[PDB]
């Protein structure tokens, strides 16, 4: 005396959908991150324009992996050079390489950071 | 566009749910905006009634 159809449309009833509980992982182990920080930062750029950026804009110029975005570049530089960075500008060179202008924090000096990297 | 008859946009009340139903009647000559038109078996003979 309570089952009533107030709409002339029959909709498909809602049934529960179980979450997958596989009996074996399809891959034995996760594939490791190939794009770690050493892979992200390939080598610094040491041209005259890069040296001008170092001595003027407090900016280090790197050649990075093409698949690395600004967040990844920032974290990679922060980890493997122990410096705080203000911002990252990214372009892709006509030869296909990706170039990152990393502007450091004001309390970090690009000149002696480049010295301890070895690109003075 | 494409036809010579004007079209009448008429708004009705939905009899079963709270909503306004808009139709696109073909304008019988003499009807005007702001006019009530009546549709059904018990409607009276007036220009625009259905």
């Amino acid at each position: 005396k309570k089952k009533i159809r107030t709409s002339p449309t029959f909709r498909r009833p809602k049934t529960l959908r179980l979450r997958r509980q596989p009996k074996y992982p399809r891959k034995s182990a996760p594939r490791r991150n190939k794009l770690d920080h050493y892979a992200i930062i390939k080598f610094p750029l040491t041209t005259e324009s890069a040296m001008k950026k170092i001595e003027d804009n407090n900016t280090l110029v790197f050649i990075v992996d093409v698949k690395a975005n600004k967040h990844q570049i920032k974290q990679a530089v922060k980890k493997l050079y122990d410096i705080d960075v203000a911002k990252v500008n990214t372009l892709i060179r006509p030869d296909g390489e990706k170039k990152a202008y990393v502007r450091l924090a004001p309390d970090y000096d690009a000149l002696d950071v480049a010295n301890k990297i070895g690109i003075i | 566009p494409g036809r010579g008859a004007p079209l009448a946009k008429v708004v009705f009340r939905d009899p079963y749910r709270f909503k306004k139903r808009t139709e696109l009647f073909i304008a019988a000559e003499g009807i005007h905006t702001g006019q009530f038109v009546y549709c059904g078996k018990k409607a009276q003979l007036n220009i625009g009634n259905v």
């Binding site: 009533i4 159809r5 107030t6 709409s7 002339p8 449309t9 029959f10 | 009340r13 939905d14 009899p15 079963y16 749910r17 709270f18 059904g40």
Partner: protein, 241 residues
């Protein structure tokens, strides 16, 4: 007496053009799924068309009381399940190991099931009673069974639901079951069942053969035709006398 004067009736009238209609039961006017429409239209077709007597005879099933007595009798002769068959086999193994031996011990009478088994029993005149479900969907497995049972002389009845026979035989579905020889204490109940069933099915086989089914119009058509008939009968009544 203490009722708040602010309370009042606020009745809404559901005439045409007035307050919008309440959410009422629309089950008659629902756009149903295609499978529901198909099964309902099949049910309607089985009443529209002329059902031949060989198919229509299965609409005559046992009444609920007679079916209750029949199933209550048949519950004493259900086939043994897998677990109790294991128990009996283990008991026989223990007994033969120590120390009685073969010991058939009078393999008890049991209800035989399956259309092929029942057909063979009927052809051999070994079955004492045949019970046929009324709703075998591929209806060719059992259409010959009433005629075959009547010719061989074994009493047969038609019962509502193959699911009940399946529950008798610990399965989902059984077309037919057969009563072969029975225990002495149940011989009297089986005799009464056979008497009633033979009165209802085997004795009136001649007009079971001729009772066609279906050929019934819809309620709207019947009402319209009766309306025409009354429309002319009301004036023929004044015409006469």
């Amino acid at each position: 007496k203490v009722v708040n004067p602010l309370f009042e009736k606020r009745p809404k009238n559901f005439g045409i053009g007035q307050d919008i209609q309440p959410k009422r039961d629309l089950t008659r006017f629902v756009k149903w799924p295609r499978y529901i429409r198909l099964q309902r239209q099949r049910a309607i077709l089985y009443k529209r068309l002329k059902v031949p007597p060989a198919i229509n005879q299965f609409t005559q099933a046992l009444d609920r009381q007679t079916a209750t007595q029949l199933l209550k009798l048949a519950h004493k002769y259900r086939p043994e399940t897998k677990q109790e068959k294991k128990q009996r086999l283990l008991a026989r193994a223990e007994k033969k190991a120590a120390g009685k031996g073969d010991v058939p011990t009078k393999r008890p009478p049991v209800l035989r099931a399956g259309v092929n088994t029942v057909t063979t029993l009927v052809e051999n005149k070994k079955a004492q009673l045949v019970v046929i479900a009324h709703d075998v969907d591929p209806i060719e497995l059992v259409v010959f069974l009433p005629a075959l049972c009547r010719k061989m002389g074994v009493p047969y009845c038609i019962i509502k639901g193959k699911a009940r026979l399946g529950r008798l035989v610990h399965r989902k579905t059984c077309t037919t079951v057969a009563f072969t020889q029975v225990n002495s204490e149940d011989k009297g109940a089986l005799a009464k069942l056979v008497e009633a069933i033979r009165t209802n099915y085997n004795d009136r086989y001649d007009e079971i053969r001729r009772h066609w089914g279906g050929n019934v119009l819809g309620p709207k058509s019947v009402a319209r035709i009766a309306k025409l008939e009354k429309a002319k009968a009301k004036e023929l009544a004044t015409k006469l006398g």
